[PDB]
Amino acid sequence: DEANIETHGMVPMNRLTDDPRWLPAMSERVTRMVQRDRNHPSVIIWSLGNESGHGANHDALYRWIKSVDPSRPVQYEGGGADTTATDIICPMYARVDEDQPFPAVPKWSIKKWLSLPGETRPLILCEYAHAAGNSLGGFAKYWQAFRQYPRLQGGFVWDWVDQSLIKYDENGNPWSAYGGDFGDTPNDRQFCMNGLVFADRTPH
């Protein structure tokens, strides 16, 4: 269960989440989620949001959850996927064997990430195997690794269903549209379609 908080377009990503003036607005998105869904057994992990970098507001709310509900682990990927605001190393698109040593927020290969000096937490990718179009190449590599390493406990593929919308031509025949087909601009075109299934749920 994930809080409705994403500030991806900020520069740097944590400009708002590290600002105490935004702590209140952020806290409500986290606290009111917990007060609502805490009795559901299906919810086993709480998430502080997505792509909002890593700010002090995250550490505060992380601790808030741990305090009001010790029955579920808390995770958050921002700021490097292994910050102090997550009980689980939850990288996105970290590769199996190949490292992507980005400055400040590197994506180590998952096998290597586990054994970094001092690291002991389990690793579950919050996003991986981006299924945009003709994709999922190398999928079997992830599962061979998940099965061989106890602390590599899987992940969540990105994602389930294409975000395409239905438009009708002059004949009234429906067709699948994506970014920019509604005169919307700027837009990121077909990047809204990364599902394992089409919008009508027909498998890819």
Q: Return binding residues for substrate.
A: 51, 127-130, 194
Q: Is 77 one of the annotated active-site residues of the chain?
A: no
Q: Is 16 in the site for a second copy (CB under 8 A)?
A: no
Binding of a second copy at residue 13 (CB under 8 A)?
Answer: no
- Residue 103, class by beta-carbon neighbours within 10 Å (0-12 exposed, 13-18 middle, 19+ buried)? exposed
- Helix count (H) and strand count (E) of the chain? 4, 6
Binding test (CB under 8 A) with a second copy, winner from 9, 24, 70, 118:
118
CA neighbor of 165 nearest in space, from 151, 146, 180: 180
**194 is a site residue for Na ion (CB under 5 A):** yes
User: Could you say which of 152, 155, 164, 179 contacts Na ion (CB under 5 A)?
Assistant: 152
Q: Are strands 174-177 and 165-168 parallel, antiparallel or unpaired?
A: antiparallel
The answer for residues whose C-beta is within 8 angstroms of residue 2's C-beta and 6 or more apart is 33, 46, 47, 48, 49, 50
DSSP conformational letter for 176 = E
Query: Judged by CB, which is closer to a second copy: 97, or 188?
Result: 97
Question: Whose CA is closest to 101, among 116, 88, 86?
Answer: 116
Choose the stretch contacting a second copy; rule: CB under 8 A; options: 10-18, 37-45, 146-154, 165-173: 146-154
CB 194 within 8 A of CB 130: yes
By CB under 8 A, residue 100 contacts a second copy: no
Nearer to a second copy, 24 or 150 (CB): 150
**Among 167, 191, 200, 201, interactor with Na ion by CB under 5 A:** 191
Q: Considering only residues 39, 42, 71, 120, which one is a binding residue for a second copy as defined by CB under 8 A?
A: 120
Work out whether 101 is an interface residue with a second copy (CB under 8 A): no
- Specify burial of residue 91 (Cβ count, 10 A radius: 0-12, 13-18, 19+): buried
Task: Please give the positions annotated as active site.
Answer: 51, 127
For binding to a second copy (CB under 8 A), which residues are involved?
99, 109, 111-112, 114-118, 120, 148-151
For binding to Na ion (CB under 5 A), which residues are involved?
146, 149, 152, 191, 194
